[PDB]
C-alpha cells in the first residue's frame, strides 16, 4: 500500500472552537492483509495520548484506512514534528512519513478591500474583491461576512507565489447591486499565522 | 479549612496563542499536617495534567498550596466543569469546589467606532472611542491597533450590565493629534465567544 | 474575627448638592445570633458627635445579623477633607474595630464633558445610543444624569470611573433612545456633577 | 517499467494569433539508460500525422532520460477541438502508452475585464498594486498582459483561472508599481486575449 499524511486545515489551527487534525490515509491495502497499525510519533515522543482514530473501509478491490490525530493549536504552530508508522504485512518494513508547520520565515499579509469597478456598478450584481498580499507560509483562511452573519457566494483563488518570496490571492464576493447600494457593508476576514491576534477584518461599505 | 477556585482569565480563553488555567489554592489550612492531595475532574471524568506547586509559608503561621490545571479552549467554551479535592486528617469534610463557564444564553456584541468630539479638535492629544454593547457572557477582549501594531495608550473599562441583561463597555484610544489629522487608520479588535469566528474588527480614520 | 465592619462614603449626588444631606454608613456584617447588641461610636476629626441613626438589626440567611448605623454629614465638612471614624464594639470582637473614611486627598481637577453622537451604523438600528464621556477629573466622585427637554430619561447606565495615565479618571455614559426620537431632532442633555465645577454642575446637549 | 508520459496543449497566445504558431508537446520522463529509444506516433483525430517535429533527447540528474516531441497544430484545428493522440514505444513498455489532448468542448463566453485602482490604505505605501479582474469566460484559455504607455510593464503576476458558480471562469492580474509612476498620471493597460473575442483581443486602460 501507499501512505499519505495531511496537515490540519488552516482554520482549525487558529480558531478556539475547532480541533486541528493531522490525518494519515493508507490507500492500497489488499484484501489479503488488510490489517493496519498506526503509530504516531510527535518529535520522537509516542502519542496514543492524543486519541488517534481509524474508522474506515474500502473501495476499488482495495482498502482506504485513514487515521486522525488530534493536536494542540500551539504545538503545530511551534514547529513540532509528527510522524506516522504503518505496520501492514504486505509492505516489507514499516513506512514512516513526516509533517511539520512550514519551516520558513513568517510574513504578515497586507489585506486590502477593493470596491467593484464602475463598469459593473449599475448592473445586477457587483463583485467585491479583497486582496491579501505578502504572506508566508502559503496557508491562510479568507472568508467574507456582512452584518455579523456569514456570506456564502464568494470564491478565493489559490495562493500564488510572488517574486517577493511570499504569496498573494484574491477573494471575490458576488453580491446583488441591491445590497451594495442599500448601504450594507461586507467584510473580508483573514486568519493567518503571522497576524497579530491571528486575525484581521477589513470593511467595504457605501 | 478554607480553599478557593479561580477561573481562567477571559483573554486566555479567546486566543489559541494563550493557555487558560484554573487555580486551586489552599490557605489557613495547612498547620501541622501538610501534604494536600488535589484531584481534578473534567465534567466528572478524571484528569491528571495538573501541576501543583510547593508550599508557601506566610506570617499567617499557615501555608499556601496552589494547584494550577490547564484548560482547553473548547471544553471551557462548552461549559465543562472542573473539580478539586482534599488534604489530610485536618479536614473531616471533603472540598469539592467546582467552576464552569458563565451559564446562560450567549449574545454577540455590537461594536461601533466613534470619532473625536469637535470640541477635542486642536488639543495635542485626541481620543477615539469604541462602543461594544449587547454581549453575554462578560468574557471579552478589546484592543486598539494601528497598522496591525497594537496601541499603547488605550484603556478599557469594566463591563457593566444593561437593562436587557446585556453588557457594554467603552475603550478610549488617546492618540496625539498628528497621527489622527494626518489620516492614519486606527481600529479596535473585540474577541468574544458569540461573534462570527469569535473575532471582529472595525476601523476608523478621518 | 467574625464581625466585619465596612464603612461607606456618602453618595456623590448628596455631597455635591447644597440642599441634600449626605450620609456615611458604617455597616457590620456577621455578628452572632448570640451577641446581637453592638455599639456605634462616631468621631468627626477626633470629636465624637451624636447624629448616628443606628438602624434596627436584620437577621440574614447566613444565620447572622447585619447592623447599620448612618451618620448625617455636611456639604462643607466632607468636601473639606474631614475624616469620619466609626468605632464598632461587640462582645465577640477581639478589638473594638475602628474605621475611618474621608474624601480623597488631592488637587481638584475639573472634568471636560464631550458628547458623542450615535455612530453611523447604529442609524440602521431601532434604538440609537448617545455617548457622554466625562474626562479628566479628580477625585473619582462624580454623578452623571441625562435629561430630555427638562425631563429625565430612563435607559441610561454609566461606566464606573477608570484610572487615566495622569492621575485623573474618565467615565462613559450611554443613553438609549428610539431611532424615531433622534431623527425628530430632540435635544438630549448630559448632566455631569463633580466637586470642581461652577455650583458643582454642568450640562451639555446632543441633537441633530 | 516506469516511463511516465504527459501531453501539454499549445499556449493561448500561441493560438488566437496567426503570427505565432501553436504546438502540442508530448514529454516522456523516466526513460532507462540501457533502453533509451522512444518512438512517437502522432495522430490528429485518428489520422496519422508526420508534421511531428523534433525528437531531441535530454539528460537529467538520475539514471533517467527526458525525451519531448513537438507537433504543430493549425489555430483553426485546435480551436475546432480536434483530439491529438500521441503513442510512445519504449522497450520498457509492453503495450504503448497513449495520451490525447484537445480543446475544451463547450460554448465560448466573452471575458469581462474590470480594472480596479488600489485601495486607500495603500496610498502611503512605497509601491502601489494595480489589479485586473477578468470575469465570465470559457474555456480557460486566456492571456493577460500589462503595458504602461506602449512599452510592456513587466512586474506582474497572474492567478490561475478558477471556476465560478455559472461555470464561467475568473482570474486576476496584479501589477506592482512604484508609487511615483502612479501619482504622476501614467496610464497602465491590462491587455487581454481570449478566443470568444472580436479579433481575439481587447485592452482597458486605467490611470488616476
Ligand atoms: C499579606 C500578604 O499576602 C500575600 C503574600 O505575598 C505576603 O507575604 C503577605 O502575606
mmCIF file with all atom_site columns, N, CA and C in Angstrom, chain A residues 50-70:
data_model
loop_
_atom_site.group_PDB
_atom_site.id
_atom_site.type_symbol
_atom_site.label_atom_id
_atom_site.label_alt_id
_atom_site.label_comp_id
_atom_site.label_asym_id
_atom_site.label_entity_id
_atom_site.label_seq_id
_atom_site.pdbx_PDB_ins_code
_atom_site.Cartn_x
_atom_site.Cartn_y
_atom_site.Cartn_z
_atom_site.occupancy
_atom_site.B_iso_or_equiv
_atom_site.pdbx_formal_charge
_atom_site.auth_seq_id
_atom_site.auth_comp_id
_atom_site.auth_asym_id
_atom_site.auth_atom_id
_atom_site.pdbx_PDB_model_num
ATOM 1  N N  . UNK A 1 50 ? -3.051  11.847 22.587 1.00 0.00 ? 50 UNK A N  1
ATOM 2  C CA . UNK A 1 50 ? -3.996  12.402 21.629 1.00 0.00 ? 50 UNK A CA 1
ATOM 3  C C  . UNK A 1 50 ? -4.617  11.241 20.868 1.00 0.00 ? 50 UNK A C  1
ATOM 4  N N  . UNK A 1 51 ? -5.921  11.047 21.056 1.00 0.00 ? 51 UNK A N  1
ATOM 5  C CA . UNK A 1 51 ? -6.625  9.876  20.557 1.00 0.00 ? 51 UNK A CA 1
ATOM 6  C C  . UNK A 1 51 ? -6.570  9.808  19.041 1.00 0.00 ? 51 UNK A C  1
ATOM 7  N N  . UNK A 1 52 ? -5.749  8.905  18.516 1.00 0.00 ? 52 UNK A N  1
ATOM 8  C CA . UNK A 1 52 ? -5.889  8.567  17.118 1.00 0.00 ? 52 UNK A CA 1
ATOM 9  C C  . UNK A 1 52 ? -7.134  7.704  16.918 1.00 0.00 ? 52 UNK A C  1
ATOM 10 N N  . UNK A 1 53 ? -7.670  7.722  15.694 1.00 0.00 ? 53 UNK A N  1
ATOM 11 C CA . UNK A 1 53 ? -8.942  7.033  15.495 1.00 0.00 ? 53 UNK A CA 1
ATOM 12 C C  . UNK A 1 53 ? -9.145  6.510  14.074 1.00 0.00 ? 53 UNK A C  1
ATOM 13 N N  . UNK A 1 54 ? -8.607  5.346  13.694 1.00 0.00 ? 54 UNK A N  1
ATOM 14 C CA . UNK A 1 54 ? -9.005  4.762  12.400 1.00 0.00 ? 54 UNK A CA 1
ATOM 15 C C  . UNK A 1 54 ? -10.436 4.244  12.459 1.00 0.00 ? 54 UNK A C  1
ATOM 16 N N  . UNK A 1 55 ? -11.202 4.510  11.394 1.00 0.00 ? 55 UNK A N  1
ATOM 17 C CA . UNK A 1 55 ? -12.629 4.186  11.395 1.00 0.00 ? 55 UNK A CA 1
ATOM 18 C C  . UNK A 1 55 ? -13.241 4.038  10.001 1.00 0.00 ? 55 UNK A C  1
ATOM 19 N N  . UNK A 1 56 ? -12.556 3.377  9.064  1.00 0.00 ? 56 UNK A N  1
ATOM 20 C CA . UNK A 1 56 ? -12.940 3.489  7.659  1.00 0.00 ? 56 UNK A CA 1
ATOM 21 C C  . UNK A 1 56 ? -12.731 2.167  6.919  1.00 0.00 ? 56 UNK A C  1
ATOM 22 N N  . UNK A 1 57 ? -13.279 2.102  5.700  1.00 0.00 ? 57 UNK A N  1
ATOM 23 C CA . UNK A 1 57 ? -13.342 0.869  4.914  1.00 0.00 ? 57 UNK A CA 1
ATOM 24 C C  . UNK A 1 57 ? -13.016 1.174  3.446  1.00 0.00 ? 57 UNK A C  1
ATOM 25 N N  . UNK A 1 58 ? -13.281 0.194  2.576  1.00 0.00 ? 58 UNK A N  1
ATOM 26 C CA . UNK A 1 58 ? -12.583 0.004  1.306  1.00 0.00 ? 58 UNK A CA 1
ATOM 27 C C  . UNK A 1 58 ? -13.427 0.355  0.080  1.00 0.00 ? 58 UNK A C  1
ATOM 28 N N  . UNK A 1 59 ? -12.742 0.357  -1.068 1.00 0.00 ? 59 UNK A N  1
ATOM 29 C CA . UNK A 1 59 ? -13.281 0.572  -2.408 1.00 0.00 ? 59 UNK A CA 1
ATOM 30 C C  . UNK A 1 59 ? -12.188 0.248  -3.423 1.00 0.00 ? 59 UNK A C  1
ATOM 31 N N  . UNK A 1 60 ? -12.620 -0.205 -4.609 1.00 0.00 ? 60 UNK A N  1
ATOM 32 C CA . UNK A 1 60 ? -11.763 -0.468 -5.770 1.00 0.00 ? 60 UNK A CA 1
ATOM 33 C C  . UNK A 1 60 ? -10.933 -1.735 -5.577 1.00 0.00 ? 60 UNK A C  1
ATOM 34 N N  . UNK A 1 61 ? -11.541 -2.747 -4.951 1.00 0.00 ? 61 UNK A N  1
ATOM 35 C CA . UNK A 1 61 ? -10.882 -4.013 -4.623 1.00 0.00 ? 61 UNK A CA 1
ATOM 36 C C  . UNK A 1 61 ? -9.646  -3.800 -3.750 1.00 0.00 ? 61 UNK A C  1
ATOM 37 N N  . UNK A 1 62 ? -9.680  -2.776 -2.893 1.00 0.00 ? 62 UNK A N  1
ATOM 38 C CA . UNK A 1 62 ? -8.532  -2.428 -2.059 1.00 0.00 ? 62 UNK A CA 1
ATOM 39 C C  . UNK A 1 62 ? -8.949  -2.166 -0.615 1.00 0.00 ? 62 UNK A C  1
ATOM 40 N N  . UNK A 1 63 ? -8.506  -1.031 -0.069 1.00 0.00 ? 63 UNK A N  1
ATOM 41 C CA . UNK A 1 63 ? -8.797  -0.619 1.301  1.00 0.00 ? 63 UNK A CA 1
ATOM 42 C C  . UNK A 1 63 ? -8.228  0.773  1.536  1.00 0.00 ? 63 UNK A C  1
ATOM 43 N N  . UNK A 1 64 ? -9.058  1.714  1.972  1.00 0.00 ? 64 UNK A N  1
ATOM 44 C CA . UNK A 1 64 ? -8.594  3.059  2.311  1.00 0.00 ? 64 UNK A CA 1
ATOM 45 C C  . UNK A 1 64 ? -8.822  3.302  3.804  1.00 0.00 ? 64 UNK A C  1
ATOM 46 N N  . UNK A 1 65 ? -7.780  3.113  4.610  1.00 0.00 ? 65 UNK A N  1
ATOM 47 C CA . UNK A 1 65 ? -7.842  3.346  6.049  1.00 0.00 ? 65 UNK A CA 1
ATOM 48 C C  . UNK A 1 65 ? -7.140  4.663  6.345  1.00 0.00 ? 65 UNK A C  1
ATOM 49 N N  . UNK A 1 66 ? -7.833  5.557  7.040  1.00 0.00 ? 66 UNK A N  1
ATOM 50 C CA . UNK A 1 66 ? -7.268  6.838  7.436  1.00 0.00 ? 66 UNK A CA 1
ATOM 51 C C  . UNK A 1 66 ? -7.200  6.881  8.955  1.00 0.00 ? 66 UNK A C  1
ATOM 52 N N  . UNK A 1 67 ? -6.223  7.622  9.468  1.00 0.00 ? 67 UNK A N  1
ATOM 53 C CA . UNK A 1 67 ? -6.031  7.800  10.901 1.00 0.00 ? 67 UNK A CA 1
ATOM 54 C C  . UNK A 1 67 ? -5.944  9.289  11.198 1.00 0.00 ? 67 UNK A C  1
ATOM 55 N N  . UNK A 1 68 ? -6.753  9.754  12.147 1.00 0.00 ? 68 UNK A N  1
ATOM 56 C CA . UNK A 1 68 ? -6.820  11.162 12.523 1.00 0.00 ? 68 UNK A CA 1
ATOM 57 C C  . UNK A 1 68 ? -6.137  11.328 13.870 1.00 0.00 ? 68 UNK A C  1
ATOM 58 N N  . UNK A 1 69 ? -5.241  12.306 13.970 1.00 0.00 ? 69 UNK A N  1
ATOM 59 C CA . UNK A 1 69 ? -4.516  12.588 15.209 1.00 0.00 ? 69 UNK A CA 1
ATOM 60 C C  . UNK A 1 69 ? -4.798  14.023 15.644 1.00 0.00 ? 69 UNK A C  1
ATOM 61 N N  . UNK A 1 70 ? -5.546  14.174 16.737 1.00 0.00 ? 70 UNK A N  1
ATOM 62 C CA . UNK A 1 70 ? -5.802  15.495 17.295 1.00 0.00 ? 70 UNK A CA 1
ATOM 63 C C  . UNK A 1 70 ? -4.502  16.096 17.815 1.00 0.00 ? 70 UNK A C  1
#
